[PDB]
From a paper:
We have biochemically and structurally characterized a minimalist inositol phosphate kinase (i.e., TvIPK) encoded by Terrestrivirus, a nucleocytoplasmic large (“giant”) DNA virus (NCLDV). We show that TvIPK can synthesize inositol pyrophosphates from a range of scyllo- and myo-IPs, both in vitro and when expressed in yeast cells. We find a heart-shaped ligand binding pocket comprising an array of positively charged and flexible side chains, underlying the observed substrate diversity. A crucial arginine residue in a conserved “G-loop” orients the γ-phosphate of ATP to allow substrate pyrophosphorylation.
Author numbering: 49 to 263
The structure:
C-alpha cells in the first residue's frame, strides 16, 4: 500500500492500484459520494470544469483523479473556502490548510493571520517557481482565469459548500498549473447560492491579481 503525500486534511488517502488514481476513504459518512452524484445529475458542467473526476467507488473508498499525476515537480496548496465546522477562518474569508515546503516557512494552520501574513504565505508557496517573473505571472493569470469563472458559476448553484478546499498546483518549471474544488463531505442542499464561498473566491482573485501586477 502506498500512502498519498497529502499536503493537508486528515482522511486516509492512498495511491490507486493503477496510474493516475488516488483512493480516498469516506471516514464519517458517504455524504461525499451522495454529493458527487447530486452534482453529476444537477450541475454536470460544474463537475467537469472544477472537480477531480470520480472514477467510481470500492467499498468506503472513492476512486478520484490524481490532480498531481502529470507533474514532474508539483507544488500544492490547500485553501479551505467553505465554512469551517466551528471556528472562524484564519485569513478572514478563507483558511490556508497547507502547502509544499510550508514547514520551511514555519507555517501553522491554527495561526490567525493578518492580510500581510496571508499574502506572504501565498508568496512563500510561489517561491519554488523560481526567479522567471514571466512564467510565475502566467501561473497566477491561469489561476485567476479559472477562479473568476468559478465565482461567476457559483451564483447559480444551490449548495452550501461547507468544508470544501481549492487545491492549487503548479510545476517547479511553471510549464503547467491548475486549481480544483475538493472535499464534498460536509456539503448540503439549500434554496439559495453560497455567498460566503463566493466571498472566499473573490478575495483570492483580488490577492492573486495584486501578485500578478505587482512589479
Ligand atoms: N483528487 C486529488 N488529487 C490530488 N490530491 C488530492 C486530491 N484530493 C485530495 N487531495 C489531497 O488530499 C488533501 C486532503 O483532501 P480532502 O478531500 O480535503 O480530504 P480531508 O477529508 O482529509 O480534508 C488535500 O490537501 C490534497 O493534498
Ligand atoms: Mg479537506
Ligand atoms: Mg480537470
Amino acid at each position: 500500500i502506498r500512502i498519498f503525500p497529502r499536503i493537508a486534511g486528515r482522511s486516509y488517502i492512498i495511491y490507486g492500484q493503477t496510474s493516475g488514481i488516488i483512493c480516498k476513504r469516506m471516514e464519517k459518512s458517504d455524504n461525499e459520494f451522495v454529493i458527487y452524484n447530486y452534482i453529476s445529475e444537477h450541475y454536470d458542467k460544474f463537475l467537469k470544469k472544477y472537480v477531480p473526476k470520480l472514477y467510481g467507488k470500492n467499498n468506503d473508498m472513492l476512486l478520484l483523479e490524481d490532480l498531481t499525476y502529470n507533474y514532474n515537480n508539483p507544488n500544492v496548496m490547500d485553501v479551505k473556502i467553505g465554512a469551517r465546522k466551528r471556528k472562524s477562518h484564519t485569513s478572514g474569508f478563507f483558511s490556508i490548510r497547507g502547502y509544499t515546503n510550508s514547514h520551511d516557512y514555519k507555517f501553522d494552520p491554527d495561526e490567525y493571520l493578518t492580510s500581510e501574513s496571508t499574502i506572504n504565505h501565498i508568496k512563500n508557496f510561489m517561491e519554488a517557481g523560481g526567479e522567471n517573473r514571466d512564467k510565475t505571472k502566467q501561473v497566477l493569470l491561469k489561476w485567476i482565469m479559472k477562479l473568476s469563472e468559478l465565482a461567476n458559476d457559483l451564483f447559480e448553484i444551490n449548495l452550501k459548500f461547507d468544508g470544501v478546499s481549492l487545491i492549487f498546483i503548479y510545476d517547479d518549471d511553471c510549464s503547467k498549473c491548475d486549481v480544483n474544488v475538493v472535499d464534498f463531505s460536509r456539503v448540503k442542499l439549500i434554496d439559495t447560492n453560497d455567498q460566503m464561498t463566493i466571498s472566499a473566491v473573490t478575495n483570492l482573485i483580488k490577492i492573486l491579481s495584486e501578485l500578478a501586477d505587482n512589479p
